[PDB]
Design an enzyme around this catalytic site. Sequence first.
Site, PDB file in Angstrom:
ATOM      1  N   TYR B  73      61.401 119.162  61.861  1.00 38.92           N
ATOM      2  CA  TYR B  73      61.114 120.364  61.081  1.00 38.92           C
ATOM      3  C   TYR B  73      60.880 119.825  59.682  1.00 38.92           C
ATOM      4  O   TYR B  73      61.642 118.949  59.223  1.00 38.92           O
ATOM      5  CB  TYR B  73      62.334 121.263  61.055  1.00 38.92           C
ATOM      6  CG  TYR B  73      62.633 121.942  62.349  1.00 38.92           C
ATOM      7  CD1 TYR B  73      61.755 122.883  62.874  1.00 38.92           C
ATOM      8  CD2 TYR B  73      63.795 121.642  63.064  1.00 38.92           C
ATOM      9  CE1 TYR B  73      62.014 123.505  64.082  1.00 38.92           C
ATOM     10  CE2 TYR B  73      64.074 122.272  64.282  1.00 38.92           C
ATOM     11  CZ  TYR B  73      63.175 123.198  64.789  1.00 38.92           C
ATOM     12  OH  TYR B  73      63.405 123.798  66.018  1.00 38.92           O
ATOM     13  N   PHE B  84      64.686 119.920  68.327  1.00 43.51           N
ATOM     14  CA  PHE B  84      64.929 121.372  68.336  1.00 43.51           C
ATOM     15  C   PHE B  84      66.105 121.925  67.528  1.00 43.51           C
ATOM     16  O   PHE B  84      66.041 123.053  67.038  1.00 43.51           O
ATOM     17  CB  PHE B  84      64.948 121.928  69.769  1.00 43.51           C
ATOM     18  CG  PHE B  84      63.689 121.646  70.544  1.00 43.51           C
ATOM     19  CD1 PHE B  84      62.518 122.343  70.271  1.00 43.51           C
ATOM     20  CD2 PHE B  84      63.657 120.620  71.514  1.00 43.51           C
ATOM     21  CE1 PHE B  84      61.319 122.019  70.947  1.00 43.51           C
ATOM     22  CE2 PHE B  84      62.459 120.294  72.192  1.00 43.51           C
ATOM     23  CZ  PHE B  84      61.293 121.002  71.897  1.00 43.51           C
ATOM     24  N   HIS B 193      55.369 124.539  76.573  1.00 43.86           N
ATOM     25  CA  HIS B 193      56.171 124.482  75.356  1.00 43.86           C
ATOM     26  C   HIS B 193      56.930 125.767  75.128  1.00 43.86           C
ATOM     27  O   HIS B 193      56.479 126.819  75.574  1.00 43.86           O
ATOM     28  CB  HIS B 193      55.300 124.188  74.141  1.00 43.86           C
ATOM     29  CG  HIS B 193      56.081 123.661  72.989  1.00 43.86           C
ATOM     30  ND1 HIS B 193      56.782 124.476  72.128  1.00 43.86           N
ATOM     31  CD2 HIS B 193      56.322 122.395  72.588  1.00 43.86           C
ATOM     32  CE1 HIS B 193      57.425 123.738  71.245  1.00 43.86           C
ATOM     33  NE2 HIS B 193      57.159 122.470  71.502  1.00 43.86           N
TER      34      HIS B 193
END
Lengths: 83, 227
Positions: B73, B84, B193
Site C-alpha cells: 500500500y 493485504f 482478485h
Amino acid sequence: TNLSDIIEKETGKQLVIQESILMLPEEVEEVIGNKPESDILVHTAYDESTDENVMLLTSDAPEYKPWALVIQDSNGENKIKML
Amino acid sequence: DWTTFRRVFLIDDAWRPLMEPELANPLTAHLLAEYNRRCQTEEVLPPREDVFSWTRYCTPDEVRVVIIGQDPYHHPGQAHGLAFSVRANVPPPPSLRNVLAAVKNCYPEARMSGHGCLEKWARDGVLLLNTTLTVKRGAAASHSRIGWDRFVGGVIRRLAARRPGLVFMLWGTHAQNAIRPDPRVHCVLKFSHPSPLSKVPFGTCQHFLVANRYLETRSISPIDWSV
C-alpha cells in the site's frame, strides 16, 4: 495530485485512493466490456457516504494514463465511464 | 554478508537457509543497490524495519498457507510488511474488506474484530507475501521493476522444496503467473482478485474452507481465520 484530482473532476468528491491493483487486459475485458491495450492499475477509493467503490483504472506505472472510471454501488452494480 | 544483511533489515535467523543462497546472486547485489540509491531521493514504504517483518512471525517450518500479493500500500501508515494487512489504526482497504468478507462466509461462527491487521494469521503460519516488497510513497508499482520478485521467487521456490504440503492461495492472474508451485506436492488454489472490480464476488471464495479441509488430511491443525 493527478489521479485523485481526476476522481474529483469526475465525481466531485474528494476521495483518497486506498489501493492500486494490477490486472491484465483479460481480467478487465471481462467487466468493462472493452479490452485495454496493456495492463491496468485499478485505483480504488471508497465513498462511505454513498457506500460506493470509486475505481479509477489507469495504465501501468510510470505512465498511469486514465482509461476508464468505474462507480460500483452497494449492490455491486457498475457505472462505467470511459475517459 | 548474511550478518550484515540480517543486520540492516532486522531479518529473523530461522530464514537464513532460504535467503542466504540468494545474496550470492549478482542480481541480488544490484537489487539492494537500487533499493539504497532510492531511499536517498524518495520516501520508501514500508519503513526499512518493516520490509521483512514477514520473516518474524513464524519460522519456515511453521508455515501452512502462503498468500501472495503485489506491492505494498502506498499511502503512509498503511503497510507494515505483510500482503493485504494494514496496521490496526487504519481502515481496511476495499480488497481487504472482501477477503475478510469471504472469511466470515466460510466461517459464520467467527467473531471478527472489524479490523484489518493480519498479524494473528502470520503467527499461525500464514505467510502473507508480496512479490514487490517496497513502493515509493504515492506512486503505485514504482519499484515493481527493480528485482524484488526474482528474489521473493527464489525464497518461495526454496520454501516449497523444503516443506511439502503447503497450501497456496493465488488471487488474480498476476499472482497465478508469478508463482507456479508443484501441484502434486502442494494444494494450489486459484481465484479472481479480491478487488471489487472482479467479475466474481470474492465473498463467494471458499479457499479458507478448502485450505483447512486439506490440512485436516495431512494431520495439520486448521487455521483459525477469525481476525
